Amino acid sequence: LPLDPLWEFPRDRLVLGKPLGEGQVVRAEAFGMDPARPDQASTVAVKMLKDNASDKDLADLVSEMEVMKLIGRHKNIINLLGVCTQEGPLYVIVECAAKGNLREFLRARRPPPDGPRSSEGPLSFPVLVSCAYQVARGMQYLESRKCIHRDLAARNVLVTEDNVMKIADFGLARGVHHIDYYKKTSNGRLPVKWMAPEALFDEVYTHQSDVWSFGILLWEIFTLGGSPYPGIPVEELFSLLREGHRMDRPPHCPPELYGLMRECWHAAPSQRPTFKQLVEALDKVLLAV
Numbered sequence: 001l002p003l004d005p006l007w008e009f010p011r012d013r014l015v016l017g018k019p020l021g022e023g024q025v026v027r028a029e030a031f032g033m034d035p036a037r038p039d040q041a042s043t044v045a046v047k048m049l050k051d052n053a054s055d056k057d058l059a060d061l062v063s064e065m066e067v068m069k070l071i072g073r074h075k076n077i078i079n080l081l082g083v084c085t086q087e088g089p090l091y092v093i094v095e096c097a098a099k100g101n102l103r104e105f106l107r108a109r110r111p112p113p114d115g116p117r118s119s120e121g122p123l124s125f126p127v128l129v130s131c132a133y134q135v136a137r138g139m140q141y142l143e144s145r146k147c148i149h150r151d152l153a154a155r156n157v158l159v160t161e162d163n164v165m166k167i168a169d170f171g172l173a174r175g176v177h178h179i180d181y182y183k184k185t186s187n188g189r190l191p192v193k194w195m196a197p198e199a200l201f202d203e204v205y206t207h208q209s210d211v212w213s214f215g216i217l218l219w220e221i222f223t224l225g226g227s228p229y230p231g232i233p234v235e236e237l238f239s240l241l242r243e244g245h246r247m248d249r250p251p252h253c254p255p256e257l258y259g260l261m262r263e264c265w266h267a268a269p270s271q272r273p274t275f276k277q278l279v280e281a282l283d284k285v286l287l288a289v
């Protein structure tokens, strides 16, 4: 509740709109986010507390806000724009990504005799590689800021109107010591399927456990938004991970990209690439195509 003049934004310059998801996130119009253009409208996302409002919920949002302030700006993350902390409910104002999360972006754009482009879907291989590259660059930035994501997944990458990838929800209290591994979200997601083995079995989280998750995200990309470990119940996932099993190479995926996935899933975190190495490896592919 103390005033931070660097980040404080007058709440009466916000017009809240339709909710985006559930703290909870609401789309809003902001006037004068740029103090040089005080009447200029922009669209932003506003994170706020739900109606439940427990003291732990508030602490978690305040903690997220403080991570937001120190992370700095990067093109491939959702950036803090401002906060409302005085004379009203706590708002954390961040960039809005017009096309939604990357999983929904891909699933809505899967390939399909009217006109000359009947076989042509919206998604091409170089653009998919660019999505992976941009996520790696954002993750590399986050890692250099000493930010571990802990649930990196296509659902947590957002897509701007210009198809820029932005990592979202990176500075969050994740309830690491009480994960319901069998928990399925309302959209059917089993988040345990993105956890590195050292995170799942030992509750150990490093930038290399994020590299594991990036490998799963790579698989999501090149299945155009498929769900990982298809048809493997959580009980069976435990055992196959204990046996060293990995996902198969997805169809229409070049061996360069499945190779990168398998590196990302090496048992020993030291045998996985760094994000810096993933950026370079992906840059080489992007340039070649």
Ligand SMILES: *[C@@H](O)c1nc(NC(=O)Nc2cc(O[C@H](C)c3c(Cl)cncc3Cl)c(C#N)cn2)c(OC)cc1Br
Pocket: 020, 021, 022, 025, 027, 043, 044, 045, 078, 094, 095, 096, 097, 098, 099, 100, 101, 155, 156, 158, 168, 169
């Ligand atoms: C604003 O440009 C805008 N955004 C969206 N969709 C959208 O998802 N915007 C969005 C959402 C954000 O977080 C939410 C909670 C979210 C969702 Cl909805 C789904 N998956 C992950 C997450 Cl984290 C954030 C953030 N932080 C930023 N932007 C529109 O959809 C129609 C429309 C508009 Br104008």
